[PDB]
Structure 1
Amino acid sequence: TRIKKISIEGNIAAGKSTFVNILKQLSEDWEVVPEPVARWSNVQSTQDEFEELTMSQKNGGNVLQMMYEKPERWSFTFQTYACLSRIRAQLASLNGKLKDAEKPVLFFERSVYSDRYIFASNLYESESMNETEWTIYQDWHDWMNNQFGQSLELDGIIYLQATPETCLHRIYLRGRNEEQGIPLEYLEKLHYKHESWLLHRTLKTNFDYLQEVPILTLDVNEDFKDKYESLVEKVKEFLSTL
């Protein structure tokens, strides 16, 4: 549609939510679809219309934690749910926000492509999904994407590049409970997937237009004040090109 869709990609705790949520104050025509991580650590489904008047919406399972604890059991289930909740949030925001905007830009915290080609794929490569799980996942992912056509197609990607060591430190700073045992090696594997996809651009996907989508790579290893001015200038220049 008229809404430009820009995905913000980068490793866990690179600083995507921080950067984008400050950035988007620069324009009333700019909005963000946050990644549904809260929904993964407290798994809930919709209450009946009458039941919710007399029953609380209780805390459900922690599928994020289950995946970290036993990835060979929970990876498929986690990845399925992560992508479904993402698509759901991105579509609803597409169809409902920025209606009265002159040059609307919707920023996505990550995309369905990072779900598959970074996160799920890394789990398949780690033998945390077997051939059957990997086949089911890709089949479902392809199907959903063909269903939407150009709906979610990206106009641009901003890659926030941080070292695995930076991300590890920032995981500690943020203090999300389920992330606290994450080892450097896991971040490193994820780092490598981001570099292949977004920087060296050697990673091949089932979605041909991606080979051509413009990418802005930003180095976010510095303390926030130290580069923010220059990053904002780069983003504004990049967007003028789309």
Structure 2
Amino acid sequence: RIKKISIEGNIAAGKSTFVNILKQLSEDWEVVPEPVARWSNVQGGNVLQMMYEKPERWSFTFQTYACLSRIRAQLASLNGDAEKPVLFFERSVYSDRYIFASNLYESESMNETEWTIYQDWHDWMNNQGQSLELDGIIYLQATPETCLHRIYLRGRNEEQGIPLEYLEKLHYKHESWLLHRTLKTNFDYLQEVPILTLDVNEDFKDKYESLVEKVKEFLSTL
């Protein structure tokens, strides 16, 4: 019943900022924030930090918890009577698996066993899920350079050592999935989901007017 729109894009592209703006446009519109605070303080251990520090040890543990915490929050938001309700997800279980987890496996931060377990867990976990299927995707496109700068602006302690090259790899995965559309998932419906690509490289005064209305254009078509 609720339209579910995922906001995708690289680390610090400006997804939280944008959706928190967008949501004031309508009482019918709510956000499900990416549960990053629950990753910083496991409840507490900093599993986010452990993964950045020791990715060969902690990537699988991190990735499983990330995805579980997202499903939990997204499902909780669907449960709690509006004209045209829209729920904006900050990222999705598909970016969890096909971007982040996948990149860790490609980097050898998860081994073949860990990647197999992750995929089997993800397959089953989402096959139960079901009510989380997306009606649309908004891709906020920023260059890895922009993302690096915004990382510094925001000042999340765990993120400060992130190298440009890591952001580059993440950028290429997003481009393969959402712009080139060469990234194959095993979720069949996903190949028919409309994607709205917004460029957010400029300082926010420069284009935010046009961006909000593009989202308005987009949502009325779903």
Shift, 1:173, TM fit: 0.2
Q: Which residue is 1:63 aligned to?
A: 47
Deviations 1:146-179 (A, max 9, x none): 11x6300000000000000000000000000000
Shift, 1:131, TM fit: 0.3
Shift, 1:101, TM fit: 1.0
Identity %, equivalent residues: 100
The 1-side partners of 2:63 and 2:200 are apart by 27
Q: Which runs of 5+ in 2 are unaligned?
A: none
The 2-side partners of 1:144 and 1:206 are apart by 14
The 2-side partners of 1:6 and 1:221 are apart by 21
SS at match of 2:196: strand
Deviations 1:108-146 (A, max 9, x none): 000000000000000000000000000000000000111
SS at match of 1:201: coil
Q: Which residue is 1:128 aligned to?
A: 109
Given candidates 76, 84, 88, the residue that maps to 1:103 is 84
TM-score by length of 2: 0.99
The 2-side partners of 1:40 and 1:150 are apart by 24
Shift, 1:216, TM fit: 0.1
Q: Which residue is 2:181 aligned to?
A: 201
The 2-side partners of 1:84 and 1:9 are apart by 18
Deviations 1:193-223 (A, max 9, x none): 0000000000000101101100000000000
Shift, 1:33, TM fit: 0.3
Deviations 1:81-110 (A, max 9, x none): 0000000000000111xxx31000000000
SS at match of 1:6: strand
Root-mean-square deviation (CA, aligned residues, Å) is 0.8
Q: Which runs of 5+ in 1 are unaligned?
A: 44-58
The 2-side partners of 1:31 and 1:106 are apart by 5
* 1:21 has 2:2 as partner: no
* 1:77 has 2:65 as partner: no
The 2-side partners of 1:23 and 1:224 are apart by 13
The 1-side partners of 2:172 and 2:66 are apart by 21
Shift, 1:232, TM fit: 0.8
The 1-side partners of 2:23 and 2:202 are apart by 20
Moved over 4 A (4+): none
Larger radius of gyration: 1
The 2-side partners of 1:232 and 1:178 are apart by 31
Deviations 1:37-90 (A, max 9, x none): 0000100xxxxxxxxxxxxxxx70000000000100000000000000000000
The 1-side partners of 2:205 and 2:126 are apart by 38
Deviations 1:4-24 (A, max 9, x none): 000000000000000000110
TM-score by length of 1: 0.91
Shift, 1:233, TM fit: 1.1
